[PDB]
Amino acid sequence: MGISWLDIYHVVSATVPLYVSMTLGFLSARHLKLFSPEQCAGINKFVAKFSIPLLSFQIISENNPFKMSPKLILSDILQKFLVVVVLAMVLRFWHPTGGRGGKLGWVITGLSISVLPNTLILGMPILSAIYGDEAASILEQIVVLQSLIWYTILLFLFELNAARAGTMKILLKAWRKLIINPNTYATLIGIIWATLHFRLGWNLPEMIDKSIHLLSDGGLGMAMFSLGLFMASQSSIIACGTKMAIITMLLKFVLGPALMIASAYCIRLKSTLFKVAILQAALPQGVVPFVFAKEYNLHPEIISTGVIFGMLIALPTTLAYYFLLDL
Amino acid sequence: MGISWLDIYHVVSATVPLYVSMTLGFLSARHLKLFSPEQCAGINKFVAKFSIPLLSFQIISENNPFKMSPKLILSDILQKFLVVVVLAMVLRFWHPTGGRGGKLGWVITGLSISVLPNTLILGMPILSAIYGDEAASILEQIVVLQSLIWYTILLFLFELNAARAGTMKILLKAWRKLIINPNTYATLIGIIWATLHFRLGWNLPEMIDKSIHLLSDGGLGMAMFSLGLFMASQSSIIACGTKMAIITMLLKFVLGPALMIASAYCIRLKSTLFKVAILQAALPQGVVPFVFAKEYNLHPEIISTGVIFGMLIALPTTLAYYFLLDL
Ligand SMILES: CCCCC/C=C\C/C=C/CCCCCCCC(=O)O[C@H](COC(=O)CCCCCCC/C=C\C/C=C/CCCCC)COP(=O)([O-])OCC[N+](C)(C)C
Ligand SMILES: CCCCC/C=C\C/C=C/CCCCCCCC(=O)O[C@H](COC(=O)CCCCCCC/C=C\C/C=C/CCCCC)COP(=O)([O-])OCC[N+](C)(C)C
Ligand SMILES: CCCCC/C=C\C/C=C\CCCCCCCC(=O)OC[C@H](COP(=O)([O-])OCC[N+](C)(C)C)OC(=O)CCCCCCC/C=C\C/C=C\CCCCC
Ligand SMILES: CCCCC/C=C\C/C=C\CCCCCCCC(=O)OC[C@H](COP(=O)([O-])OCC[N+](C)(C)C)OC(=O)CCCCCCC/C=C\C/C=C\CCCCC
DSSP: OOSOTTHHHHHHHHHHHHHHHHHHHHHHHHTSOOSOHHHHHHHHHHIIIIIHHHHHHHHHHTSOGGGSOHHHHHHHHHHHHHHHHHHHHHHHHOOGGGSOOOHHHHHHHHHHHHTOOOOSTTHHHHHHHHTOHHHHHHHHHHHHHIIIIIHHHHHHHHHHHHHHOOHHHHHHHHHHHHTTOHHHHHHHHHHHHHHHHHHHOOOOOHHHHHHHHHHHTTHHHHHHHHHHHHHHTSSSSSTTOHHHHHHHHHIIIIIHHHHHHHHHHHHTOOHHHHHHHHHHTTSOOOSHHHHHHHHHTSSHHHHHHHHHHHHHHHHHHHHHHHHHHHO | OOSOHHHHHHHHHHHHHHHHHHHHHHHHHHTSOOSOHHHHHHHHHHIIIIIHHHHHHHHHHTSOGGGSOHHHHHHHHHHHHHHHHHHHHHHTTOOSSSSOSOHHHHHHHHHHHHTOOOOSTTHHHHHHHHTOHHHHHHHHHHHHHIIIIIHHHHHHHHHHHHHHOOHHHHHHHHHHHHTTOHHHHHHHHHHHHHHHHHHHOOOOOHHHHHHHHHHHTTHHHHHHHHHHHHHHTSSSSSTTHHHHHHHHHHIIIIIHHHHHHHHHHHHTOOHHHHHHHHHHTTSOOOSHHHHHHHHHTSSHHHHHHHHHHHHHHHHHHHHHHHHHHHO
């Protein structure tokens, strides 16, 4: 009914291609030694500047902004705000790596981990099967919200952190670096388009659609490839260590879903919407935050280890959360 | 009937996405300066090692080897043999760029130009519209033949040229470098699969299909992006000069189709098969030979310029050949 041995195969089939691309990249960088560190950085930069922005535009444009659930958006925003508050407060007392400082980069890493899960590739096969078609729409809205708001805010935070190493000048520099990002323009053009298309009926010219799909089609595969390329340069598969890996897992699969449950209860969600909203926050970490961290070199090892170890822990964790919510 | 103003739009729509990726890459390398030469080389290496081989596997596997036209295969082989003979004989008297040696590299460039046109992306919209469904199958068989035989032989020739700078040792070195290429294994596994699938009914597991499509979907777009990246490093758009550009155009749009006509007459093709066979040889140059030339650094400027200026000359040239063949 809710779970069978055929939907588990669907989850495994959704997860395996990503790991295959990851392993291909890792072998290429380490064993085959096809790519040098500069070439790996170039591949990651191409993914960050052309693949992710075009994926974001494709996701946002094909979503009706006027059919989005206001309560889902409020729940997502409240979850992000609660996670930010918790990360800011905890860092005030307990600081990773001995209390050196840099509490803004740690908040960026914590937001990349906790509140930006992989919602489409791995979140569809399990949640849609367990619940149905409502889960599909909810997850699509969540992914649209990610690409539209949360990636842009994450990039702004990355640029603000980079600018920090009198305050208004730093914010101005971060903003100036943002308004040249392909991602902010992707989100703006995508939302403007979506509005025109779903309110005026305009259809994207076939030439432009094909042009976008030509370069954006392999975005996810290249993101996993870049993750493997980065892993090839690390001493061990757990690049961040055992303690930091445990902390990453706790943030992703306990803090994330717990604060999402708090957000859903505060917003007073009900039924399938509530259940899918609090179950999607337990989905694995996702690779776009890793791409941004690698581009800005902000603890990419932690994000990569979380991504690698979350794709395996998602299914048991999603099943555990489903069973917990059932009774 | 044969040609209208709606099929011209189809040709333009097929051509434009490639030029859009080309221009994006060119701007990135030259104006935005996102990629350094090492990073551009890394992107091209990824395209050559993962995109083109997986595209070749997809093309070969999805083609029934037992339904291929023997006469079409014979005509293609005879074209290639005649073109090789002509290139070898002409180089014996007239040498490009004054007078020097290196006649094997010039033959490789001449084969990349004359006898490896872009058959699917730009060859479908015009030939299928003018003729119908027979053109589709003929062009698919031609593309399968390319990916299966001609890319492998071109790579072997590239490796043989590289090894040259006593003869049996050079051939052994070229063979050893070949049997580690992803392309030879792609073709071999693709043909073995195609055989099993179309003779025993085996279906490729969905996981493997998704894994291949994850890394191969953005293959052509990245190839055009790499072409733009290379163009960004050249002094002028006509990287090979005016005389060499003219020679490239003559080889692609006169020698290629002319020797295809000779081959078809020798093999005694008839009707739509004959016409499509001799009209597909006039299609533009295609980017995979450029990717290989850039990887081996064998006159990449000439192949690049031919690709630049053939996508614009193909439609008038294809129309001219169609009118010539009509009467
Ligand atoms: C438009 C809606 C709002 C969206 C937000 C975007 C833009 C507007 C906001 C701009 C301000 C950004 C924060 C600057 C604060 C500087 C403080 C300082 O002064 O130092 C900061 C301290 O930071 C903090 O503790 C936390 C700051 C805020 C964290 C992030 C805020 C997130 C914003 C909105 C919620 C949504 C989040 C999700 C986004 C990602 C997607 C999941 C860093 O330096 P430090 O003092 O720790 O150095 C060490 C010095 N010693 C050793 C002496 C102590
Ligand atoms: C399995 C079926 C057959 C497929 C072919 C593959 C493998 C088997 C063949 C192996 C031999 C390869 C050629 C080595 C010859 C060395 C000659 C020499 O000694 O020098 C060669 C000379 O070359 C030539 O003139 C032409 C050689 C042959 C050209 C290519 C042959 C193509 C093969 C098959 C037909 C299909 C082609 C299409 C493939 C691409 C897809 C469109 C180079 O040096 P050079 O002397 O000019 O130097 C200069 C010295 N000075 C200045 C003193 C003169
Ligand atoms: C509305 C009109 C049609 C669409 C054109 C408009 C915007 C496209 C978005 C971004 C590129 C153009 C605007 C970017 C700001 C200008 C600066 C720039 O040139 O910034 C390139 C960007 C950052 O690089 P930088 O740090 O070197 O900047 C510094 C460059 N300098 C060294 C020269 C100073 O780098 C990059 O790769 C830029 C991204 C290149 C790949 C394209 C991604 C586009 C994403 C989504 C939209 C896609 C399709 C359109 C949908 C249909 C609409 C009807
Ligand atoms: C039959 C069993 C399943 C398929 C596995 C078999 C073959 C796959 C093809 C190629 C990779 C493995 C064999 C390659 C030869 C071994 C050498 C190697 O490791 O060579 C990697 C190749 C060249 O690199 P190198 O010059 O550094 O070699 C020197 C490396 N050392 C420095 C260590 C000496 O580089 C590369 O990227 C290699 C290519 C990596 C990307 C994969 C492309 C595969 C293409 C088509 C087949 C795809 C899917 C399977 C279809 C379904 C089948 C049922």
